[PDB]
Design a protein around this ligand. Structure first.
Ligand SMILES: CC(C)(C)NC(=O)C[C@H](NC(=O)CCc1ccccc1)C(=O)NCCNC(=O)c1cccc(-c2ccccc2)c1
Lengths: 204, 201, 199, 213, 196, 219, 216, 199, 196
């Protein structure tokens, strides 16, 4: 599997006016933990984060090209990108490499710029945009996160319960994986503030 | 998995981590990796698990037959050598078994390494498993045959600790025994990450 | 797949089974394997159904430009030279086979065979995977100088035989009789296929 | 190339309390892209104290359980006592390993009561290699049910939570709620639930409905 | 085989490498240098398949020098690392897959010293210390045992000789002499080659 | 992914499941598949989801532009033609097994265009992994000239048989009734599954999560 | 038997109140060719059992000679003990499984139905050792086409009168004729009940092609 | 290779071509594919000629021991059960096919098919690589209740058709008519093969 | 890797080997002994795939000791070399292909000293000196440059340290200490291990 060459899994999750994006922090070659502060959640606006996963070079390359097209958009436009626009952009970008695909499985989490409606979406490594309403995951340890999220998620959770849910989701979900973990980062995206939180994960 | 063992003034301490990973997935993470054969034998395990469990348990069966027949408490040489024959019979059949036989015989603390191929090695310092090399590095820089049991134990926890820190296939809790003159005694089954935070601050 | 054509005096008769199967389960149990290239030039498809379709359409395009530019109905030899060129130029990429048949003022009925990119006029030019089971019948029952009804009942018999034995062929049997009057499209329902020795 | 293994899916589950041992599995018997039967419970009552699960290649599940029970009556004949859970565990390790070179491709999870009336669950792998745990999932949906059972049963990654002993009812609602959490997402899980409870009183059987789609 | 190593303390970066360029059994050269002076304050450490190292890394060297001659100043080490990251990533899927593992140790007047890692798949990751080759498997746990964020450069060299003595004791390949350079606000300081 | 079609007296009607797997795991529960092509020409999507999306979206644009050009309704022959030339040019790599349907001045026409380019007009069809069950029931109960109600219940029987009888196709069925008058996207026609509730609340009071580092940014 | 030479198509099985009825068309193929058009793929084992088989046909005849040999050896004793359908099912499961264990697999997908003691058994055994009971079975592509029809109707009516079952089998076989490429309009229907095993056939399937004139 | 058998009232008729080819150049242009298993039981070989020969000889041995031990001519069903057993027991090692035919007091003429190790009585049981080209003809020209001359001219026609189309079949056509009187071995020279539509 | 070496002068055989038993990157043991004392006057030097060496060569050791206990005398070194040659050849095509390279250095009271070579295909060849492993590719030409049939054993050791110093300089693998034994009419003399 080329995808699990670096490992790492990122999920988002939707609340009551706030979507929280998580990620692990283990940049590792196959079995060798190399770094514990590798960035996977790249901001794309005041309230819009695009968490990527997979092979490292496609993480950073997709993030940087996307930030290219996004600064061109915001400059050439008069406006920050709406989350649905950003989703169609990233889907276009992964799909331009249809036969040489970036091994990145992004999930985009954020708010409407004007109305501040929560938004998420996950994509596959060729760009099948799959907007959802409860959550998304991505990366080498997707399954454990489907279990923990599908069991822990509930309709209309305010920010704090959201941080509890996504907290335990990432912790339990990565501890049962070898190629991920080494800490966890979490972002709550409210209407007015943005809280960054790292978590105490097993260091082994 | 990372498994090491060394011997010094006061016997032989064998430390093993406690994660067992089916490929990229962590099957169980408080596994007991050190099969206790006799009151004072000790054989660790590594690689494919079922080979170590079956062949090393069977090794305990041979040792028990010996101890009933000759009544003289089979030595470490016969132990590692006999397991060496169980492995050498099925050469190249795919058995993935890298293990170590710690003990205490008439000649003294006999530490042996028994490989899937038939490799058999006495020695002072060993470290097997997927993350063995790290344990080599952190053991050597900090090994000296005049270590007391305390400094020995801390040295083990540092070894298995960082060995599971840089490794992907290793973690959980660290088992670490102390094969004294009158037999082993389990010194600790310590959490790993808590150790790494005690070592990072 | 069992498409068949026959040459008789006033024109031709292009029978063809009506199944396209995907492996062991069929996808389409009715499929007209006779797509017109002009008013009076049909091509019987076979092989890669998508590939055969693309060839029939491109060939229809060139035959229509060449058709209007001369202001006279394009001779069948022209059509089988364009389908022959397009089947030969891509022979590593198309598993197609197109028994292109039709009528034209200058020569009358024709049935050109174009397997693999070659061009050979023939009396009866049967093709398709089921065609390997009816060589015996057609050789034993073909007599030159067939009246039209003899050609139609003949090809109906032959494709009937192929349908009973072959798994790649089943369904209904389409028949068209191309002559100076025009095309006479007919269909043979499964209740009308002439029954043969069934055991 | 003839392939002698096929993944007939269906997940099992086992939990150990202070005095019991539940075993549960879905009865969808999938293969490829179909559903053979929506009923083929993957728990097999071995004795009065031992309920063995089997997932994976269904044929080797049948053969392996048949061999186990035959070994139980061999043991009972030569020893005048049924095998405990300990003996059944070890014996199923040598059965699963004696074919080390063409495996039984069947994730067993033997749950039951040892001779001290206390819970015990021996999760296996296809080539032997057992252990005693307090809880375990296996099969297709093991990766979606395992972490949640760590959470609500192992209480890991919690703070300020009393590690209360596992009560039979709360273990029940854990079993059913987690199999629902799998039925939503796992393709191979669903169509039924066969929950067998083990106590000193015998073996009581309980079934549950799930998503069919 | 080839072993880089780099440590990043308060105000420097003490990179060290091995000095062997082998051919399948025989060390053809024991005075080879694997550290390519980018600019006044930027060392590039490249190891891996032969031909990729010299060609690639001299390409990067020439682009950086070109930048300084175009604009009168030098790339800040973050910029250089993300640049070489660009070329190695854009060449990752191209006609010419360069199989090089890097460490672009650097010190900026503003941001301070930083030691960028890079596997051959263009994965960039700032780290307080790194390694490569099989010798990483025997040294990184040693650096973990002895590293401290406030380590002094003398203590750095002492540590580094502990790592390298470990290679001479345990690692299987004959790696006799190691290059060692330091980088601070005063530029590059070609320190004394460690031998055994 | 089990999509089907049907043709009755007045117009066509397209079915679709609402699930999309990721190799063993049901990724989505409410993915749409009856996409948009023209104001009355809809295109269902089976196979590689990304390629059905991109293909049908491009062809959607060409039919919109064309539609403003000719000042007329788009004819489904055009849509199928551009779809199968686009699919054919790539030589089947773009595994997007569309089933395009619509209502022209000629009448209701339900084409089906496979990944290599082979299209075939026909009165009823069903693509996707659950094409077995859908083809089964459609074969068994189809009739020329059906009532739109009998068509709706019939197609729901079909895509339903795909839902229950297949693994990689589940969730809710979506049927879209197209007629000469216009299109009505009857989203989520039937919902076989009911498992939406539960009985175990899993809440952790704030503070049960061990947080190491923190920061807040006002906006 | 690593490769199939003369295979059959899908077999259909379906229970009903007081007996089991299965159908399997009389075709025997050789590749795409329909070489043998009058071979029967449904055996009578005794008054209470009757068996079916897709896949390789030669191995089906090996199981005919062996299996009928067993039931004849057992009838020889005249001790009143005859193999119920569960015994024959379990036996074929073991033979098929063991042959798999030697990697010499019998390339059959048999479907054993029987009726002993007023209880309609209906088994399944494929080449790899998979086995189970069910109210409705269909080997091969029958598990794709006829299987959804049978589980649909049995879902609508888990208890079926005999004739309703027979029409259900006829209509499933109609679908198999229309859509299964290795099929043929010539099938047997076996009915096992209180009275015994009755094998009707060769039957045929009326076919409709009104859609053939719909394309335009 | 195109061997064929037919069942008629008094007995059978086993036609067979007379070529065995090695790839694209023939090795033997005359080869009797009908080796007797008893006085009135012939087996038409095909496939691996060596394997078919070994099968015919072993089967002749067992059929002769069983023949004498009962002191009565072995029924054809017996013969096709021994050739069926030997073709099934070795099916991974023999590419053989043996349409074993003959006569016997208890049943009259029979033609059992034994391809792949199976046993199925049939009216006409054609086999061989050329047999895939005459299914059409035989299905169109077979009517039950054939007099012997109808069977002989029939199989001669059929194998003639297969010989004209197939490359694996050529030469002369052997015919034997097994009845209560005895075997009547006949040969069809290449100058006597009934000519069909040649183009 | 593993490097044997043997020289045969007027009245002795001075065999030397390396003392490393590696595992794919790491010297697990640096005091391992690759010379298996057959009898009073016969050393067996076995290198190659692990498991084959100890099992095979101890099999030969036990057969030789058995011979001496059966008949009160020992195998002459020609006999032992052709014996091990028999087992290795008869096992060459058998169920158990032992991949061992040997040198059975010996001294007989009558025939004098002789140094038998053996590749892993059971090819036997008496030689005045031999080698194995990749280090043979860097030493045998040295022995050719310095060997003389009348070499004295002191000169032998000097030569041997020239060869081994060549391995420490040029050969790629970390081979730190070498065993060295001599064999004369007085039996085996465990001489001082060469280190570096
Ligand atoms: C946690 C439980 C109790 C279930 N066992 C497994 O999952 C065992 C785990 N074994 C498997 O998945 C079987 C995979 C397999 C599939 C098909 C054919 C052959 C093997 C396994 O060991 N996977 C990594 C290899 N082995 C090890 O990494 C290892 C190393 C040292 C000790 C142990 C160990 C032994 C006994 C108990 C606990 C740990 C395992």
């Amino acid at each position: 599997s080329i995808m699990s060459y670096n490992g790492g899994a990122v999920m988002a999750m939707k609340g009551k006016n706030c979507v929280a994006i998580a990620a692990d922090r283990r940049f590792g070659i196959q079995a060798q933990m190399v770094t514990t502060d590798f960035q996977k959640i790249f901001p794309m606006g005041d309230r819009l984060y695009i968490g990527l996963a997979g092979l490292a070079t496609d993480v950073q390359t997709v993030a940087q090209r996307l930030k290219f097209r996004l600064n061109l958009y915001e400059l050439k436009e008069g406006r920050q990108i709406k989350p649905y626009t950003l989703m169609s952009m990233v889907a276009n970008l992964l799909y331009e490499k249809r036969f040489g695909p970036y091994y990145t499985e992004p999930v985009i989490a954020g708010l409407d710029p004007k109305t501040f409606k929560p938004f998420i979406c996950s994509l596959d490594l060729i760009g099948c945009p799959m907007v959802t309403d409860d959550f998304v995951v991505s990366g080498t340890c997707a399954e454990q996160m489907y279990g923990m999220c599908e069991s822990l998620w509930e309709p209309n959770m305010d920010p704090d319960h959201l941080f509890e849910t996504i907290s335990q989701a990432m912790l339990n979900a990565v501890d049962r994986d070898a190629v991920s973990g080494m800490g966890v980062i979490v972002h709550i995206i409210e209407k007015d503030k943005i809280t960054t939180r790292t978590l105490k994960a097993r260091m082994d | 998995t990372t498994t090491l063992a060394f011997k010094f003034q006061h016997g032989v301490i064998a430390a093993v981590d406690s994660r067992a990973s089916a490929g990229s997935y962590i099957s169980a993470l408080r596994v007991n990796k050190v099969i206790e054969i006799n009151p004072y034998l000790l054989g660790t395990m590594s690689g494919c698990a079922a080979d170590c469990q079956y062949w090393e348990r069977l090794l305990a069966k041979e040792c028990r037959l010996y101890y009933l027949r000759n009544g003289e408490r089979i030595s470490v040489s016969a132990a590692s050598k006999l397991l060496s024959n169980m492995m050498c019979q099925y050469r190249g059949m795919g058995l993935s078994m890298g293990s170590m036989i710690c003990g205490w015989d008439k000649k003294g603390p006999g530490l042996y390494y028994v490989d899937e191929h038939g490799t058999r090695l006495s020695g002072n310092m060993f470290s097997t498993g997927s993350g063995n090399t790290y344990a080599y590095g952190v053991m050597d820089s900090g090994y000296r045959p005049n270590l007391s049991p305390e400094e020995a134990y801390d040295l083990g926890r540092r070894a298995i600790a960082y060995a599971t820190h840089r490794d992907s296939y290793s973690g959980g809790v660290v088992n670490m025994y102390h094969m004294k003159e009158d037999g082993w005694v389990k010194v600790e089954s310590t959490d790993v990450s808590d150790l790494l935070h005690q070592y990072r601050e | 797949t069992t498409i068949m054509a026959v040459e008789f005096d006033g024109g031709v008769v292009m029978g063809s089974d009506s199944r396209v199967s995907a492996g062991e389960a069929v996808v389409n149990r009715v499929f007209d394997k006779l797509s017109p290239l002009h008013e009076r030039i049909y091509c019987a498809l076979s092989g890669s159904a998508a590939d055969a379709q693309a060839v029939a359409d491109m060939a229809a395009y060139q035959l229509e430009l060449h058709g209007i530019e001369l202001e006279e109905p394009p001779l069948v030899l022209a059509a089988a030279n364009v389908v022959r060129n397009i089947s030969y130029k891509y022979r590593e990429d198309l598993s197609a086979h197109l028994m292109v048949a039709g009528w034209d003022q200058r020569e009358g009925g024709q049935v050109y065979g174009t397997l693999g990119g070659m061009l050979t006029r023939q009396p009866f030019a049967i093709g398709g995977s089921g065609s390997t089971f009816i060589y015996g019948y057609v050789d034993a029952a073909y007599k030159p100088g067939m009246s039209p009804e003899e050609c139609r009942r003949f090809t109906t018999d032959a494709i009937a035989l192929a349908m009973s034995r072959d798994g790649s062929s089943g369904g209904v049997i389409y028949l068209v009789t191309i002559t100076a009057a025009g095309v006479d499209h007919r269909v043979i329902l499964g209740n009308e296929l002439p029954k043969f020795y069934d055991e | 190339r003839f392939s002698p293994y096929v993944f007939n899916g269906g997940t099992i589950l086992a939990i150990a309390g202070e005095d019991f041992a539940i075993v549960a599995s879905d009865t969808r018997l999938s293969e490829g892209f179909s559903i053979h039967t929506r009923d083929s419970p993957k728990c097999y009552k071995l004795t009065d104290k031992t309920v063995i699960g089997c997932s994976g290649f269904h044929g080797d599940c049948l053969t392996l359980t048949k061999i186990i029970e035959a070994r139980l009556k061999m043991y009972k004949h030569s020893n005048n006592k049924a095998m405990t859970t300990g003996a059944i565990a070890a014996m199923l390790s040598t059965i699963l390993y004696s074919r080390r070179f063409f495996p039984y491709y069947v994730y067993n999870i033997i749950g039951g009561l040892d001779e001290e009336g206390k819970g015990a669950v021996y999760s296996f792998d296809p080539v032997g290699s057992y252990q005693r745990d307090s809880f375990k999932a296996g099969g297709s949906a093991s990766a979606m049910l395992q972490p949640l059972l760590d959470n609500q049963v192992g209480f890991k990654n919690m703070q300020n939570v009393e590690h209360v002993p596992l009560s039979l009812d709360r273990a029940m609602r854990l079993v059913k709620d987690v199999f629902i959490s799998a039925a939503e997402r796992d393709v191979y899980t669903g169509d039924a639930l066969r929950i067998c409870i083990v106590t000193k009183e015998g073996i009581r059987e309980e079934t549950v409905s799930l998503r069919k789609d | 085989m080839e072993y880089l190593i780099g440590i990043q303390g308060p105000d420097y970066v003490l990179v060290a490498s091995d000095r062997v360029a082998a051919s399948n059994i025989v060390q053809m050269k024991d005075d080879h240098d694997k550290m390519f002076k980018m600019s006044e304050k930027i060392l590039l450490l490249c190891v891996g398949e032969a031909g990729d190292t010299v060609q690639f890394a001299e390409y990067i060297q020439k682009n950086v020098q070109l930048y300084k001659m175009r604009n009168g100043y030098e790339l800040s080490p973050t910029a250089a690392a993300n640049f070489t990251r660009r070329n190695l990533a854009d060449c990752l899927r191209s006609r010419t897959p360069y199989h090089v593992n890097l460490l672009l140790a650097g010190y900026d007047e503003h941001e301070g010293p930083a030691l960028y890692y890079m596997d051959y798949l263009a994965a960039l990751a700032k780290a307080p210390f790194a390694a490569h080759g099989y010798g990483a498997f025997l040294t990184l746990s040693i650096l973990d045992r002895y590293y401290t964020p406030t380590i002094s450069r003398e203590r750095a060299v002492e540590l580094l000789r502990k790592c390298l003595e470990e290679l001479q004791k345990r690692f299987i390949l004959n790696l006799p002499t190691f290059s060692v350079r330091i980088i601070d606000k005063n530029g590059i300081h070609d320190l004394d080659n460690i031998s055994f | 992914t089990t999509i089907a079609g049907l043709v009755f007296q007045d117009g066509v009607i397209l079915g679709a499941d609402t699930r999309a797997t990721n190799d063993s795991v049901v990724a989505d529960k409410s993915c749409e598949k009856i996409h948009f092509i023209a104001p009355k020409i809809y295109c269902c999507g089976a196979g590689v989801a990304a390629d059905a999306e991109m293909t049908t979206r491009m062809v959607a644009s060409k039919m919109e532009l064309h539609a403003l050009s000719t000042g007329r309704e788009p004819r489904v022959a055009t849509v199928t033609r551009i779809l199968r030339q686009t699919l054919f040019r790539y030589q089947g790599h773009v595994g997007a097994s569309l089933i395009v349907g619509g209502v022209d001045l000629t009448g209701p026409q339900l084409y089906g265009v496979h990944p290599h380019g082979s299209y075939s007009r026909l009165p009823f069809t069903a693509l996707g992994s659950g094409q077995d069950a859908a083809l089964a029931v459609l074969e068994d109960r189809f009739q020329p000239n059906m009532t739109l109600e009998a068509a709706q219940g019939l197609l729901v029987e079909a895509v339903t048989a795909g839902i229950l009888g297949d693994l990689g196709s589940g969730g809710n069925v979506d049927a879209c009734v197209i007629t000469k008058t216009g299109a009505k996207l009857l989203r989520t026609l039937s919902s076989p599954t009911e498992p939406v509730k539960r009985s175990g609340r899993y809440h952790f009071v704030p503070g049960t999560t061990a947080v190491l580092t923190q920061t807040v940014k006002p906006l | 038997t690593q490769n199939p030479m003369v295979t059959g198509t899908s077999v259909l099985g379906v229970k009903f109140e007081g007996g089991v009825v299965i159908a399997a068309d009389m075709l025997g193929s050789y590749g795409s060719l329909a070489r043998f058009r009058n071979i029967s793929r449904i055996m009578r084992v005794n008054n209470s059992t009757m068996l079916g088989a897709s896949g390789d046909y030669a191995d089906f005849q090996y199981l005919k000679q062996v299996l009928g040999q067993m039931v004849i050896d057992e009838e020889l004793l005249g001790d009143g003990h005859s193999y119920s359908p569960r015994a024959i099912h379990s036996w074929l499961t073991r033979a098929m499984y063991s042959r798999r264990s030697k990697m010499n697999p019998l390339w059959n997908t048999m479907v054993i139905g029987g009726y002993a003691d007023g209880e309609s058994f209906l088994g399944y055994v494929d080449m790899l050792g998979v086995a189970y009971e069910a109210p409705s079975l269909a080997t091969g592509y029958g598990a794709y086409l006829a299987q959804p029809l049978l589980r649909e109707v049995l879902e609508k009516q888990p208890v079926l009168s005999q004739t309703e079952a027979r029409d259900l089998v006829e209509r499933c076989m109609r679908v198999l004729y229309y859509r299964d490429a290795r099929s043929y309009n010539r099938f047997q229907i076996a009915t096992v009940t209180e009275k015994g095993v009755e094998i009707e056939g060769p039957l045929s399937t009326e076919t409709n092609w009104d859609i053939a004139h719909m394309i335009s």
